[PDB]
């Protein structure tokens, strides 16, 4: 079926190899920015007709891509580099990506084996620095094994619990000639042994059980439903359970429906924390009870049976002890409950409509609120009108801090894989070269980057990617001159003593620094900015309108907070509801 | 002497103290960026007035500001960031520090102890993940060993073989209140032990011996005499033997000297790699035998007695055989062979001038030489101008590739701590944060960065920083709308098949882009572009005269190649002298 | 309340401290072998008058003797050993207290710290070599973390799942004089916030609630009962459940009850797997799903509910994934359930008889059988008359192989911390040393280390431990002149095809050799052999009456095999229950 460049007999670079490895496994786009290490792979590459190469401005942008093209396509993202800089610059990537569960193969190159360990030109333990940070990762040290371990990258990385791998190639295996052998089989007994299987009825059926004795029943839904928006959706209809989402779940379950609690945790809803909090049955799918979302481990759903489906055993009673545990691919477990609730569906006659309610009063008293100053520009509502304009189909990716969570509140994801944030180890620019990766592996869709101020300007230099790539991204910066979340705990917890957290220019207290526009026009791409609330539709509309990139500057007071807030470590009587910097 | 702020009885903060134990080092200057992990080190910085803190744009600028600080003072730099995200963001700043021997202490953020390990918010395990690429790291587990712990860090960071060290602080350390104690004693009786005493006189006499009793001596400089600019000065006025400097080594002793042979290596003078190719004893002062200036190790320096003394063991007889060595500090070595050159002088009777004219024929016929093509400007030329303009005294900081070799190449450093070059790692990004730093510790210098347009892009948002820190960074950019380096070996070893070398938009390939006028005018930074070599002085003489930053935007044809030439493991008669991308 | 030897404020040795530290544990016995590195030690230890020292005649004696100790006892074990050849010798009984969770705390002495990685006299990095042997181990750099760390050693050998914990002592250290602080506060911040909290009503009230409705439920009791023999006892007489013990669990319950199912597992009862097989709520208490006891995992208890109780988050859902999880002290989840089960007992009405009754039939069809050959002595029936001798009261310690089973399958233990067997490592050599200990804390218990001839010889040396410090140990050898086990294995799997398994001199082929009783003579240990059953009935009785050691020497037919047995991965209807070697 695959037809390769090179005849089966006819000897080829291992560089060659590597590639048709990639082929090999379905690999169309790879982020890879070009070093004296991986200059094989490179020329390699060019050989390639179907696979095409996004070069970013910064390896870290490459990374950040491949993420984006991962989070929003539900295939691995691949990004290479060379030695030793090149490589140490995807640290944040590969963190990052183990951390959100992201699939993701990351290739560098290194200097010739022999030369290992001698403090070489451009040399860097890369396997040694990323073992901590990386589901799994190799050094090949014979053109024999390529085919074998780039197999089993992909395998590892989009297997089980999605994460990355790292595959280190030194020089001279690059250049060594060779016939590959595409037969080998993978060395992973013990993964494979470990790998969970199908859920068994006996567990689901205790489930369902548990349900229909519950009457405060609560979905606790999170990124490990990404693929199971359809399984979810029918659980939800044949259940009547109020759905609460974590910030990597959005989109798993339409935030625009009534059953929707939106999301919980330190920024979340009060409604959702509130079931939560008085739940009698708190479902657990595809979350790790993150301390963002539990707060006081011993507070959290501490009135509840817990039921914990995960993919992962090590993360089965990690931090919160189930009553009821399956250890097994959530959109299984979740077909296979389906199957018992339509047929036992008369002799259950499930209804929490008195659940229902009692939140529904809460989603009323308490809910997601913003306040208007004169003509300026509320954040929140910016995010609202970009909802409403692009009528909720858009693939958002962010940056980190405030406009992330009011990117998170205030716009309601249809489907997964169009939320693309960076949440556990929350790393700042994030957003646009994310924006990148989605839109490559999204041409017709709408991409738009919900930035800061000072996430956006550490990987601005992408920008330039985004215009000789010609890739349709648009740019929702909200510009509020400071690092926002650390600035919002400047006020809370320490007299608002500001510490660093000013991104302005204090000669000029006023004007906005730097001129965001003028990043944009550098690298050729349309920009405006925006101040007054009356402007904003028309200025939305002309970014989403205007083909091709676009960056829309929208200047927002600083003293806003997010809210609600349950403080680190809090319990639900600790939220707070009011009060901002003002 | 040292005055505190805090009663010698009254508790305070573990932030406070790490602040204080800062100030007792002799701190006045940090590169820190905010992050929830270090909020309370933030606000601790803002209770000092002794130290200042240069909020860069990102974590890396922060890492490679706080090297050029230390590569342009000869004190510790010192860089500050939150957990995870912030703390990978200085993985290439430390790798970079540690091949470069650089003295460096980072501070990072930590979550609080006991959530060390459950992958909690911005939680990353940075001291696995540094322990390969820093001298030393720690993970501070009690308040009570913060004074100890950071003069520790100092002390090993700055003596020896400098380096960098990390320090990691846990949150809840940051917040816990005590009393510190400034007299606890170090805990390094291994490393104590280890330090080299002052060299032997029965050592230093044998080597003063080898010296008359040769006849084609020959001196191989490099950054361990960055501190014996005198003694070595001294050394070769009493020996006239010729200096062959490394890349680290530039300015130890003036380029700009007769008995002066520049740079040697791959990219080195022909005369120089001459002069080591037939000397009859190879003088090795604090440089690394890397491959970059050995290219094959049998063939370097074949025919002579090598004398090797470094500061560090483990180097000596790493990858050359030394026929005599001497393990300490090579500023005490000269000292002290100076004395014995001085005293048994007259009946030393030492002339090399034989030696020095078979050289300086070498000189005459294989110079350093450049190509002028019609009005285009040659950036060997620019770099030489600049020299001329500043009349060599300026502080220069580079990226890497093509311009760094010429920066390298055509100015002439009068003094060490100067040159401002990532060499080990070779990381891109380097020269306008580095640029930064120096600025920082030497107010009253000329600073210019001699970028290149793919090295300054990755951390271009540091001109915001320079804006708002109203630095007077001066911007020398030679932009050849390509990755110079990477593009010289496709057209050496690759039939000049570019792949993925061009940083410019193939839909207006003649266009310059992108425009980094823009870049500078979005942080207010004035900027010119130069194309005709007539308009040159002019040019740069404004950026001169122009009171604080200024970007000098320099178009450059790409086909130009660094020469001379050794291919990598290469021998002096592999050679190339000439020859283009054209 | 406790009387220090030292003034408050005298400084003295490290050693010292070191000593007290343990005296302030409660430490009376230890088990140490001089050498250089821990020389000031043992000067220290003959200062103390509150602990003794059993110096064995092989470091590797002093562990096993030191798990005896601990095994009998409930308290920790220590043993001591120099540096290098002393600490490595320990390293069996390490691995083996980390495989049993046996609480043990070992010393070793260092080369002084200066001197560590010096490849110093002596010198071994243990702490590096037993990192994945230990539950945990520290490197004292310190004279004044001494207090500290052994506090935290004994805590953390002692709380949760026990384990051993190496401290290693440079002796620089042990001479430095200073002035030790008892007050100083432990840094277990992550352990301590990780240590399960008390058992919820909630979790416990379900599993009282699976109990009623199951009717075919079983107790897989295990080593992490051992503490809880009250608590177990008053569980099953009010469920009547009936009890499957692991062969770290003998003990826990009564072997000799009519609800007593006895050992489970590979050379488990038929019945006891058949219960376990055949149930349809699995009641797993401290136990750890071994695949000595599971064989395929997927055929284990596949019928039926498992409720899995541990007091170690990382064991459970490690092998079997369970239906219903507890994290915490089995002693106080029976404590809960018992009361529970005290009260709703007229609710319930718990009546398992017919389950219990399906059960007898199978104890009766399918009992542990042996058979008598002649005059020859039957392995089995030598220890089951001494457990008729010794009335069942005697602690046991034993070697691995057949003689281990069948002191596990012909003995009825009536409480726990009676069964001192090595079952996870199963090291050879371990009973005489654990025999050892267990008679040093239990001065007044008949003590009897049923051993192997193979197991025997490894650590014959201690025997003059034992005579020297008049120990009344009893040695039941059952010798049968070949490694057993692994006899076995060759005739059931490698057609009989013996490969160095024959432990007797082939020049005699019919000669037992050696001649253990002038081992025993050689330490003036009384002793004497039988070869008639019809000699053994006296033969035992004599030994148990003779005052002192003794060792008596049991011939036994070797082609003897251990049944039933269910080959290693294989199910119960792979089970094995005729044949032997003839
Ligand atoms: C500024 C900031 C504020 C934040 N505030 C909040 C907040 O208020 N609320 C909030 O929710 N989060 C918040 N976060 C995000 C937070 O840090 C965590 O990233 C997030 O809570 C993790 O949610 P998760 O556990 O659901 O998803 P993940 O972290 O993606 O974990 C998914 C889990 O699902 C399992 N799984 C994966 N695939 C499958 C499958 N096929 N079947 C079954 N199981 C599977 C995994 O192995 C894993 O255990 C914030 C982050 C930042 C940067
Ligand atoms: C594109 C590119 C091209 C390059 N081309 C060249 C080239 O052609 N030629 C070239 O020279 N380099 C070149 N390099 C730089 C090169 O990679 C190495 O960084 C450089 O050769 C190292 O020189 P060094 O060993 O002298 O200095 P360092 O790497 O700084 O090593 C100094 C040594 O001195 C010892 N020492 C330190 N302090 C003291 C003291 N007080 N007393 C005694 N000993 C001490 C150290 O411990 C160590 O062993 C290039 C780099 C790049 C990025
Ligand atoms: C030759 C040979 C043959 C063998 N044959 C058999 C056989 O046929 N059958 C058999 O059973 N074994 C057999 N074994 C022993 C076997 O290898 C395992 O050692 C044994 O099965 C382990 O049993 P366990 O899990 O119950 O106890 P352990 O290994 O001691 O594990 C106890 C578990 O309890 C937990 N726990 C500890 N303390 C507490 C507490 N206070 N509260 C709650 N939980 C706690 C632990 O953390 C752990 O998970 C054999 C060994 C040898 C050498
Ligand atoms: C300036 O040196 C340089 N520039 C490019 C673009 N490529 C390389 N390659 C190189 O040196 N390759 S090598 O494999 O012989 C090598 C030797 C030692 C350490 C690392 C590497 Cl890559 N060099
Ligand atoms: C959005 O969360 C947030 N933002 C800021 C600016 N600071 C913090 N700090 C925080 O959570 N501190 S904590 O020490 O209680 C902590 C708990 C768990 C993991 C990491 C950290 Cl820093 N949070
Ligand atoms: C034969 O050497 C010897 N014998 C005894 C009984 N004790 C020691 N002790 C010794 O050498 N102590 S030392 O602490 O100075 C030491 C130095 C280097 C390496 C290890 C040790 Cl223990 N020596
Ligand atoms: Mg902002
Ligand atoms: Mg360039
Ligand atoms: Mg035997």
């Not at 093209?69 to 090149?86: D, E, L, N």
């Not at 992909?154 to 001279?172: E, I, M, N, Y």
């Not at 990117?407 to 924006?435: D, E, I, T, V």
């Not at 929208?554 to 809090?570: A, F, K, N, T």
Request: hydrophobic residues 40%; glycine residues 8%; aromatic residues 8%.
């Amino acid at each position: 079926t695959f037809i390769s460049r090179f005849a089966p007999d006819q000897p080829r670079k291992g560089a060659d190899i590597l590639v048709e490895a990639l082929e090999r496994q379905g690999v169309e786009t790879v982020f890879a920015y070009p070093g004296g290490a991986s200059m094989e792979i490179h020329q390699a590459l060019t050989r390639s007709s179907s696979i095409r190469n996004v070069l970013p401005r910064h390896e870290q942008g490459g990374v950040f891509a491949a993420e984006g093209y991962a989070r929003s396509s539900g295939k691995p993202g691949i990004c290479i580099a060379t030695s030793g800089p090149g490589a140490t610059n995807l640290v944040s990537g590969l963190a990052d990506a183990l951390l959100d569960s992201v699939p993701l193969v990351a290739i560098t190159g290194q200097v010739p084996r022999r030369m290992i360990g001698t403090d070489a030109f451009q040399e860097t333990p890369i396997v040694e620095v990323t073992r901590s940070i990386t589901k799994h990762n190799y050094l090949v040290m014979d053109v024999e094994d390529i085919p074998r371990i780039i197999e089993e990258a992909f395998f590892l990385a989009t297997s089980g619990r999605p994460g990355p791998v790292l595959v280190d190639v030194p020089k001279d295996i690059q250049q060594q000639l060779a016939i590959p052998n595409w037969e080998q089989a993978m060395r992973l007994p013990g993964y494979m042994s470990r790998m969970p299987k199908p859920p068994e009825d006996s567990h689901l059926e205790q489930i369902v059980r548990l349900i229909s004795e519950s009457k405060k029943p609560v979905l606790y839904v999170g990124g490990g439903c990404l693929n199971s928006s359809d399984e979810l959706g029918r659980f939800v209809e044949l259940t009547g359970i109020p759905v609460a989402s974590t910030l990597m779940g959005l989109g798993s379950y339409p935030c625009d429906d009534e059953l929707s609690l939106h999301m919980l945790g330190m920024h979340g809803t009060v409604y959702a924390n509130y079931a939560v909090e008085h739940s009698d049955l708190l479902l657990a799918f595809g979350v790790r009870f993150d301390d963002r979302v539990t707060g006081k481990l011993e507070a959290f759903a501490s009135r509840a049976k817990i039921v914990h489906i995960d993919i992962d055993s090590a993360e089965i009673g990690k931090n919160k002890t189930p009553h009821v545990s399956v250890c097994g691919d959530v959109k299984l477990a979740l077909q296979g409950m389906n199957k018992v609730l339509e047929n036992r569906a008369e002799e259950l006659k499930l209804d929490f409509g008195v659940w229902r309610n009692e939140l529904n009063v809460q989603k009323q008293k308490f809910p997601l609120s913003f306040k208007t100053f004169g003509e300026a520009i509320p954040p929140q509502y910016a995010i609202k009108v970009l909802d409403e304009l692009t009528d909720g189909k858009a693939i958002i990716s962010t940056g980190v801090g405030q406009h992330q969570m009011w990117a998170a509140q205030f716009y309601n994801y249809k489907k997964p894989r169009q939320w693309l944030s960076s949440g556990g180890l929350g790393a700042m620019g994030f957003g646009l070269p994310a924006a990148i990766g989605a839109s490559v592996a999204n041409p017709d869709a709408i991409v738009v980057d919900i930035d800061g101020d000072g996430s956006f300007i550490m990987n601005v230099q992408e920008l330039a990617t985004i215009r000789v790539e010609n890739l349709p991204v648009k740019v929702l910066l909200l510009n509020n001159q400071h690092l926002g979340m650390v600035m919002q705990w400047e006020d809370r917890f320490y007299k608002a003593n500001r510490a660093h957290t000013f991104l302005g220019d204090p000669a000029q207290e006023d004007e906005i620094f730097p001129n965001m526009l003028l990043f944009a026009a550098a690298c050729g791409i349309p920009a405006a900015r925006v101040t007054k609330k009356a402007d904003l539709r028309e200025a939305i509309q002309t970014m989403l309108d205007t083909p091709g990139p676009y960056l829309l500057d929208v200047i927002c007071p600083h003293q806003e907070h997010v809210l609600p807030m349950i403080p680190s470590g809090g319990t639900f009587n600790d939220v707070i509801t009011e009060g901002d910097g003002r």
